[PDB]
Structures are given as C-alpha cells and as structure tokens.
Design a protein around this motif. Structure first.
Motif, short mmCIF file in Angstrom:
data_model
loop_
_atom_site.label_atom_id
_atom_site.label_comp_id
_atom_site.label_asym_id
_atom_site.label_seq_id
_atom_site.Cartn_x
_atom_site.Cartn_y
_atom_site.Cartn_z
N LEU A 27 20.44 -22.05 -60.46
CA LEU A 27 19.87 -22.13 -61.66
C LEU A 27 18.95 -23.27 -61.90
O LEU A 27 18.41 -23.26 -63.16
CB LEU A 27 21.37 -22.37 -62.78
N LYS A 28 18.65 -24.13 -61.10
CA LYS A 28 17.70 -24.93 -61.17
C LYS A 28 16.24 -24.43 -61.56
O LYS A 28 15.92 -23.49 -60.70
CB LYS A 28 17.57 -26.16 -60.11
N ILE A 29 15.45 -25.05 -62.22
CA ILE A 29 13.96 -24.28 -62.57
C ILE A 29 13.06 -25.63 -62.74
O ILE A 29 12.07 -25.81 -62.97
CB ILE A 29 13.90 -23.74 -63.87
N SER A 30 13.46 -26.92 -62.00
CA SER A 30 12.80 -28.16 -61.93
C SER A 30 12.85 -28.83 -60.56
O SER A 30 14.04 -28.92 -59.92
CB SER A 30 13.23 -29.14 -63.15
N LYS A 31 11.78 -29.03 -60.07
CA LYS A 31 11.75 -29.98 -59.05
C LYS A 31 11.51 -31.64 -59.20
O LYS A 31 12.40 -32.32 -58.99
CB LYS A 31 10.50 -29.85 -58.13
N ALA A 32 11.21 -31.69 -60.46
CA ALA A 32 10.92 -33.15 -61.18
C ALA A 32 12.06 -33.42 -62.15
O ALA A 32 11.88 -34.28 -62.96
CB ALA A 32 9.53 -33.38 -61.67
#
Length: 51
Positions: A27-32
């Motif tokens: 569900l993650k959509i962010s590397k930062a």
C-alpha cells in the motif's frame, strides 16, 4: 583482512539483503515517506469555486 567482533552485524545484514524483496498488497506509494519535517506545508492558492 576480516572485521573484528561486535561488527558481525554487518555480516548478518550483508548476507540477509541478498535473499529477496517482495510483499503482496503493497500500500505504500512513497519512497521519500521517510522524511522528518512532515509538518511543512507549501503555500497553496486555491481557485474560487464557481458556486
């Protein structure tokens, strides 16, 4: 020459990383997403709604 004791953690991590990477339903959509000053907000100008 090899490393001394108390640093065997580097060996553990190095050998572990190679195994694999994967996860279903990621569900993650962010590397930062690992930032610190999450409280900052850019000055945002909204356009006037029609009605």
């Amino acid at each position: 020459c090899p490393p001394p004791p108390q640093l065997r953690l580097l060996d553990f991590l190095q050998k572990r990383k190679e195994r694999k990477a994967g996860q279903h339903y990621d569900l993650k959509i962010s590397k930062a997403g690992n930032c610190v000053d999450m409280w900052k907000r850019s000055p945002c100008n909204l356009a006037i709604p029609s009605e």
